[PDB]
Amino acid sequence: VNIVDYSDCFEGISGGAIFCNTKNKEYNIYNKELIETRRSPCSTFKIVSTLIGLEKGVINSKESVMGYDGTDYPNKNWNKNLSLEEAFKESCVWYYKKLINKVDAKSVQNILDDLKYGNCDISEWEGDLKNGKGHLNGFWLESSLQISPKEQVQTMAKIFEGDTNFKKEHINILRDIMAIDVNDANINVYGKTGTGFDEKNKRVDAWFVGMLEREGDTYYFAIKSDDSNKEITGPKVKEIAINIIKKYYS
Numbered sequence: 001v002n003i004v005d006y007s008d009c010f011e012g013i014s015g016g017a018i019f020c021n022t023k024n025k026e027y028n029i030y031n032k033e034l035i036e037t038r039r040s041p042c043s044t045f046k047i048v049s050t051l052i053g054l055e056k057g058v059i060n061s062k063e064s065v066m067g068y069d070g071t072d073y074p075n076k077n078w079n080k081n082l083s084l085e086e087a088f089k090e091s092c093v094w095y096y097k098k099l100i101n102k103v104d105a106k107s108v109q110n111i112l113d114d115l116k117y118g119n120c121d122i123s124e125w126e127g128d129l130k131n132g133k134g135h136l137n138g139f140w141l142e143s144s145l146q147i148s149p150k151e152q153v154q155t156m157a158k159i160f161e162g163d164t165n166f167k168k169e170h171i172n173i174l175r176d177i178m179a180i181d182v183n184d185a186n187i188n189v190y191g192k193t194g195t196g197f198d199e200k201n202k203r204v205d206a207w208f209v210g211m212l213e214r215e216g217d218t219y220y221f222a223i224k225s226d227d228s229n230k231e232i233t234g235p236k237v238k239e240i241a242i243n244i245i246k247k248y249y250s
């Protein structure tokens, strides 16, 4: 465990980072207190909910559809019968809500328990209804389920090193749809953003979680901001994460 200083890449934004290479158990940690603090995963839960849906047969491939019903949404790309790949990349809430609501709560509880997914608390299945957004809510969106950045990395490692019971075919579907382009062909980066606002503490939950492959070595990582500035989003923390990867992990 090496404590490191990534502050320059954070460019004044409050946050922390953890990178882990499980081949040589080297843990690089910036802001240890924050890296161990549990918070809502927000849209980073799509990594796990995709695997749940695949395991239960609700979806089957990166083409799979969830039967769009014509409801009007402000994001143009949500207004279609989009595939799993598109729903993941567009963070389509209705698709992932419909997917998870086809799965019984005990199945979800047991999968989160097996993954050690933070507090594994799905008690508020409906999510944070007091925000007024109704069915555009759930236990993983600023609600009962909470996970620390370190636990995110531990979960990512368990999944992608083949240490869970999820099918290898399903893990490869997730790998494919998580791949991002960082304009450097010598590293393969995979990840997912998440954005929430913690109404209790007046702080954002801005995430980028994923993995980095660079010539035989693999690093599992989680970058997290808790800034009070509502402008700080998942996509913004992904930029920060990419800056760290290019500076320290290339």
Ligand SMILES: *C(=O)N1C[C@H](NOS(=O)(=O)O)CC[C@H]1C(N)=O
Pocket: 041, 042, 043, 044, 090, 091, 093, 141, 192, 193, 194, 195, 196, 233, 234, 235
């Ligand atoms: C996920 O955190 N969410 C879904 C959607 N995409 O967020 S992301 O760009 O950080 O991946 C909008 C924000 C949030 C939500 N409100 O559900």
